[PDB]
Amino acid sequence: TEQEDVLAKELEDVNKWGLHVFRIAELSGNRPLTVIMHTIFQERDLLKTFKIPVDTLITYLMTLEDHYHADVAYHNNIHAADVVQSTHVLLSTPALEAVFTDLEILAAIFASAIHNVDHPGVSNQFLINTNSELALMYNDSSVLENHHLAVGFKLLQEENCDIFQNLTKKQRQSLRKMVIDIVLATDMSKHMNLLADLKTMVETKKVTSSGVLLLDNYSDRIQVLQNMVHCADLSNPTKPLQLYRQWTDRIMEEFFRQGDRERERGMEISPMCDKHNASVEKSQVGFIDYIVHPLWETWADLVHPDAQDILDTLEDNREWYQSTIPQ
Amino acid sequence: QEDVLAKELEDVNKWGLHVFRIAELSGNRPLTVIMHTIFQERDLLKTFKIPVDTLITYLMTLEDHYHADVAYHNNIHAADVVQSTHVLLSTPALEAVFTDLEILAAIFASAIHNVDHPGVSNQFLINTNSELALMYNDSSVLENHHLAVGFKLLQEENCDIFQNLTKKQRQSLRKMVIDIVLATDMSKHMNLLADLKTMVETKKVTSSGVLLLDNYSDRIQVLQNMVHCADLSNPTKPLQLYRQWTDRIMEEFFRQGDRERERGMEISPMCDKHNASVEKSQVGFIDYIVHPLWETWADLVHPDAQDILDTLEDNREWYQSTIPQ
Ligand SMILES: Nc1ncnc2c1ncn2[C@@H]1O[C@@H]2COP(=O)(O)O[C@H]2[C@H]1O
Ligand SMILES: Nc1ncnc2c1ncn2[C@@H]1O[C@@H]2COP(=O)(O)O[C@H]2[C@H]1O
Ligand SMILES: [Zn+2]
Numbered sequence: 259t260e261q262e263d264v265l266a267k268e269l270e271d272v273n274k275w276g277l278h279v280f281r282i283a284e285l286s287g288n289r290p291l292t293v294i295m296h297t298i299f300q301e302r303d304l305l306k307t308f309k310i311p312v313d314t315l316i317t318y319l320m321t322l323e324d325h326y327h328a329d330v331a332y333h334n335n336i337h338a339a340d341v342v343q344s345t346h347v348l349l350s351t352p353a354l355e356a357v358f359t360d361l362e363i364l365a366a367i368f369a370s371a372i373h374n375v376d377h378p379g380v381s382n383q384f385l386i387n388t389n390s391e392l393a394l395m396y397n398d399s400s401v402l403e404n405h406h407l408a409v410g411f412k413l414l415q416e417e418n419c420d421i422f423q424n425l426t427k428k429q430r431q432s433l434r435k436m437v438i439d440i441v442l443a444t445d446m447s448k449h450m451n452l453l454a455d456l457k458t459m460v461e462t463k464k465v466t467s468s469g470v471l472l473l474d475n476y477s478d479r480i481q482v483l484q485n486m487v488h489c490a491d492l493s494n495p496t497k498p499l500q501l502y503r504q505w506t507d508r509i510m511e512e513f514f515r516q517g518d519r520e521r522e523r524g525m526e527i528s529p530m531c532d533k534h535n536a537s538v539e540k541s542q543v544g545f546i547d548y549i550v551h552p553l554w555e556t557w558a559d560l561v562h563p564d565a566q567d568i569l570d571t572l573e574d575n576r577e578w579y580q581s582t583i584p585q
Numbered sequence: 586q587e588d589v590l591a592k593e594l595e596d597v598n599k600w601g602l603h604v605f606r607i608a609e610l611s612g613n614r615p616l617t618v619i620m621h622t623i624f625q626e627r628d629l630l631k632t633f634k635i636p637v638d639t640l641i642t643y644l645m646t647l648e649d650h651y652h653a654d655v656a657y658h659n660n661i662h663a664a665d666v667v668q669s670t671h672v673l674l675s676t677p678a679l680e681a682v683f684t685d686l687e688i689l690a691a692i693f694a695s696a697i698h699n700v701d702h703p704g705v706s707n708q709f710l711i712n713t714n715s716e717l718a719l720m721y722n723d724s725s726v727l728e729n730h731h732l733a734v735g736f737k738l739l740q741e742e743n744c745d746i747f748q749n750l751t752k753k754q755r756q757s758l759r760k761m762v763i764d765i766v767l768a769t770d771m772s773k774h775m776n777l778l779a780d781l782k783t784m785v786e787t788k789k790v791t792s793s794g795v796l797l798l799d800n801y802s803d804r805i806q807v808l809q810n811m812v813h814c815a816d817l818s819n820p821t822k823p824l825q826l827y828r829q830w831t832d833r834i835m836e837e838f839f840r841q842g843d844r845e846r847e848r849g850m851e852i853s854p855m856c857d858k859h860n861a862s863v864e865k866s867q868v869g870f871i872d873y874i875v876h877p878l879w880e881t882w883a884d885l886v887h888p889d890a891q892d893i894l895d896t897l898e899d900n901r902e903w904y905q906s907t908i909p910q
């Protein structure tokens with residue numbers, strides 16, 4: 259019964275990188291997305307700011323969480339909760355103080371919460387190559403991302419689920435656009451272009467009298483939020499090793515299952531999905547070297563020196579995985 | 586009747602085909618009869634081993650999904666865009682520039698480009714928080730839907746007209762069609778035209794004046810513009826046809842405006858029947874959209890599009906003359 263006290267204790271670390279999200283998932287009876295989102299909304303006073311009825315928020319969150327699949331090892335409600343909490347921490351970085359409006363903050367967090375809802379455990383390419391109904395619906399482009407958005411928004415229409423019921427028409431319109439822009443940017447096929455623009459921004463960065471980042475147009479503002487959520491989505495390798503390894507174990511299980519389906523169909527097996535020819539350690543070093551570090555090193559420069567500890571952890575984790583290779 | 590229809594279809598290769606007459610003489614099956622005629626004309630059934638019964642079955646099914654109660658965006662418009670693309674594909678300057686598969690894609694794309702159109706615009710669907718807009722995240726809403734429906738119908742009993750195409754040919758065709766239809770989104774017109782101009786400025790042709798394309802990027806770009814031109818070809822057709830198209834689109838527009846007014850929404854351009862100037866609208870449409878596009882296409886295939894451009898300018902002059910004062 260006092261399990262509630264332990265859960266409440268763990269939630270006290272909501273503003274910290276390295277939150278025990280798996281512990282929270284268990285303590286909450288598999289409701290990590292609901293309790294973490296609720297905690298963050300309270301912390302940021304979002305219910306008051308946007309006049310969100312608490313029962314409406316909880317009802318929508320439970321419904322949203324219900325639409326993530328419990329039988330998918332990585333792309334589930336725990337991942338959603340993790341991305342939400344990570345985005346929440348990134349939004350609080352000193353270099354971004356007073357930069358974003360409450361609506362933009364709300365957009366980034368909501369986008370993080372719905373960014374992978376109803377994920378089937380297989381990639382866009384798998385869905386395209388197998389002529390899936392989802393790929394048919396979305397014409398082979400940002401198939402899953404479009405779906406995550408459609409489901410996330412559609413659920414707002416369920417009984418007592420419209421958490422944005424008291425926003426003005428203009429606020430709702432702006433929020434919807436920002437959320438779409440953010441989730442569509444999580445498509446890995448857009449990673450290189452997204453990173454290229456972030457690098458350009460860092461190279462031409464301008465700060466205010468306080469040293470805080472200066473963003474004076476939608477293009478730049480949405481770009482930072484897109485990269486912020488993308489960094490959160492790719493934050494596993496930057497977390498304490500015990501968390502990172504659990505995430506890796508989970509994604510490998512999901513990858514291997516996709517590989518088994520591809521093999522059975524006579525399809526070429528996707529990278530990292532062949533359990534018979536796998537090099538988990540080498541794959542993590544590659545993932546960090548070619549994707550995660552290039553991105554995070556750039557984000558760290560944008561908010562320097564705010565993310566130095568996060569970058570240090572990432573580099574330590576890369577060294578650790580690399581050390582398991584010299585055989 | 587079947588004799589009259591057969592005779593009208595004899596001009597399938599001519600700009601200005603009596604598409605409305607064909608729609609009447611075919612029991613409102615202009616898309617099916619015109620697509621079939623074009624496929625036979627290009628020997629596409631034998632080339633891609635397309636069972637006649639399969640093609641007809643798919644075509645009738647596709648045509649059935651265009652709304653007969655929508656004045657403009659219906660099966661007649663689809664048939665007209667298909668026939669217009671078919672003629673533009675026979676442009677001397679583009680002779681032998683495209684493969685049979687690419688030709689099949691351009692024509693297929695034209696046939697399905699507006700399927701299941703509800704009679705209202707993307708902006709209307711977005712502003713009314715429609716299910717379509719919810720599904721497609723306010724991004725090229727109708728275009729995405731037209732493609733989804735067009736492809737899904739191929740899965741109906743005896744409707745897979747691409748059944749005998751190789752796995753790669755099917756993948757290639759699907760990609761080209763998506764690329765083409767998404768390009769019909771008017772919100773992409775200015776960028777599409779801008780890039781067309783760029784192509785014209787650096788174009789390269791043979792001694793005989795045949796256009797030289799170097800890769801898929803070039804070939805698909807020309808195809809996107811070709812179909813876009815076909816979609817915006819009404820003002821370049823014989824006046825009798827152009828006026829019928831205008832009457833039809835205005836009716837569709839006014840009906841949308843009535844819905845916007847009732848909902849308390851801002852009425853879209855040309856949709857307010859109480860403050861409408863049809864003639865002035867046509868002149869503006871030609872001056873800012875249609876002429877700039879066709880003048881550019883004309884240069885690309887110079888001088889094969891001169892007659893089309895001449896007709897457009899004649900129609901512009903006529904519509905302007907219907908404006909008093
Ligand atoms: N721990 C991880 N190890 C390897 N690849 C990962 C890991 N976390 C995320 N990814 C990859 O990063 C991608 C981010 O977007 P997706 O969820 O589409 O797919 C994810 C994987 O391809
Ligand atoms: N005859 C016409 N008169 C006015 N506008 C037209 C005419 N034909 C096409 N259009 C416009 O061109 C657009 C082409 O794409 P849409 O069908 O989305 O919407 C069409 C109209 O906005
Ligand atoms: Zn994710």
Ligand SMILES: [Zn+2]
Pocket residue numbers: 662666698699816
């Ligand atoms: Zn059209």
